[PDB]
């Protein structure tokens, strides 16, 4: 007869906007307990501690701007003391954690505890291309499910309308994880093809970075326009080939496909990096130290990791867009040589 | 011998299109250099506008900041622009499409072949029925499309962008190719020609959606949100209403998802749009003040999809298309629009 207890792992800008909704609606909703811990990486600001700040005034300004979370989140330091209790743990932290929390969590959730991954990037690994919630799924032993779609942050934070996609095996869970969170302004559909909508989230990102890139060399948007159309064209591919089962066309126009490829070139912080680096001569990792906190995107990781697992089976040459962006990111092909990538692109694939 | 183009529109799209058109004739062999432009003939200044055009090599009313290549002609008599041409491009407002073809009806070359570039379906004629088969019917040619994320003041800058061709023929498809490709103008040409052309009128119903919404005050999760919904109605709408074989497929050429983010982001029905939603000033206004009375195809289009959905009583079906509709003729608040995504199918 209990009440599902949510843990959210992770408050960083898309974190907070999260808590803000989950905090939100646990409290409106019976079948959910009221008191929503957050996983808060503990800072130093101004000599107060951040989770102290948070609690204190609830709100976390330096992730999120302008707004107040409600009084019901509570920031814990400590990820094994946040998580404990949980029934549901929303993975919401920068791809460079998810490997200590997961292997400082093992072993100390409850029995039947659930997980949803909002973590945008892929892993690797032999055999190839590597689910970072299959990765938490199994170094925890957890159920999972993932919650992709075009969020910007800051929008979502203002309860523009916007949708989502999950991205649920089960469809009790999926239904749970959708009133869990589902308000008038951020809509959610729920899917059974989790991995095609994860390898979404990922790859949008590369195809970002290229559309950033073509901003920062003056373009407009019917260049933007059938970067995204090309960028689509790839990421289909790209999932048919190397994610395993049923991988159709349709999945990619939910909300983790062509929306979140839309709103993220034109509005997210990959693309915004990406122009920066075409526009000023300095490399990505100190674009990110002066624009984004110091935090690691993920655009660039992800074409990374798609060389290697494409030079694996020898089909580099087939994604001209997504290895155009990795040339460019790591081995410095002029960014003014991009529109090439486009120029000769297959037609179909 | 070579093949004479008449290029029947002069407007905006119609003088990005000449740019294009006059300089792959002048470099093909295949093309013969004079290509003839049907201007409707106007007042500037106490000139004739056609006597301007051929003088300066300018249509700056139409196309700002852009000369046209000195061998595109200004012609103010259709019949005569176009009754030695082999291939016709039609690109001309959808009002004058009558009036044209019953000008030139009996007065073209008898191998002569068309292509439409014109973003609309027929108002009237129940049952949905294409432009270019309104043309093709009428002067009894063989019929193609060309539709892409062409925003034409991009295009006449020559920033990189692509189109799509519509064509059934293998061969004419490759000819309209070689006229119309740039190393800035990528074309896929495919043989699903209505699904091509049905994409283009549709995607500018959405474009009004994008704007009301823009100018409500919302951003970028909003208007990815009304191009995904959007485009999920072009899809239904087109495999329920057109004939033929319908294809997702096809809405993935530049036609589909490419021509309706640009239009959303950048075009004159969002732009309209936006100032509608805004100033409360009339569509007809706004036309006047931003498309020198150029009737806005949106609209239109949406006004021709509520007559073929009401008429079957399927206008719930339809959420996107028909608040579009609404807000255009039957008084809705433009601060109502946020209700059709909130309740949006989530398939169709």
Not at 101 to 112: P, S
Not at 163 to 187: H, S, V, W, Y
Request: glycine share 10%; aromatic share 6%; net charge negative.
């Amino acid at each position: 007869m209990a009440s599902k207890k949510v843990c959210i792992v992770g408050s960083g800008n898309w974190g907070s906007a999260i808590a803000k909704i989950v905090g939100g609606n646990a409290a409106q909703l019976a079948q959910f307990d009221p008191r929503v811990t957050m996983w808060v990486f503990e800072e130093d600001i101004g000599g107060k501690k951040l989770t102290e700040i948070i609690n204190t005034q609830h709100e976390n300004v330096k992730y999120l701007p302008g707004h107040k979370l409600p009084p019901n989140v509570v920031a814990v330091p400590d990820v094994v003391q946040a998580a404990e209790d949980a029934d549901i743990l929303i993975f919401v932290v920068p791809h460079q954690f998810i490997g200590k929390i997961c292997d400082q969590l093992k072993g100390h959730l409850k029995a039947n505890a659930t997980g949803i991954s909002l973590i945008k990037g892929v892993d690797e690994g032999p055999n190839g291309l590597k689910l970072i919630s299959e990765v938490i799924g199994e170094r925890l032993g957890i159920p999972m499910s993932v919650l992709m779609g075009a969020n910007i942050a800051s929008e979502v934070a203002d309860e523009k309308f916007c949708e989502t996609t999950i991205g649920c095996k089960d469809p009790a869970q999926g239904q749970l994880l959708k009133e869990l969170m589902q308000t008038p302004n951020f809509r959610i559909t729920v899917v059974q093809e989790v991995d095609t909508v994860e390898i979404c989230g990922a790859l949008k990102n590369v195809v970002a970075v290229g559309a950033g890139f073509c901003d920062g060399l003056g373009f407009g948007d019917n260049t933007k326009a059938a970067v995204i159309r090309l960028g689509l064209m790839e990421m289909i591919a790209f999932a048919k080939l190397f994610c395993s089962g049923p991988v159709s066309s349709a999945t990619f126009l939910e909300s983790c496909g062509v929306a979140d490829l839309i709103t993220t070139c034109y509005g997210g912080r990959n693309r915004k990096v990406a122009e920066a680096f075409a526009r000023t001569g300095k490399s990505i990792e100190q674009l990110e130290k002066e624009l984004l906190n110091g935090q690691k995107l993920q655009g660039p990781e992800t074409a990374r990791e798609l060389y290697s697992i494409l030079q694996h089976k020898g089909l580099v040459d087939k994604f001209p867009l997504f290895m155009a962006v990795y040339k460019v990111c790591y081995e410095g092909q002029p960014v003014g040589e991009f529109i090439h990538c486009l120029q000769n692109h297959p037609e179909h694939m």
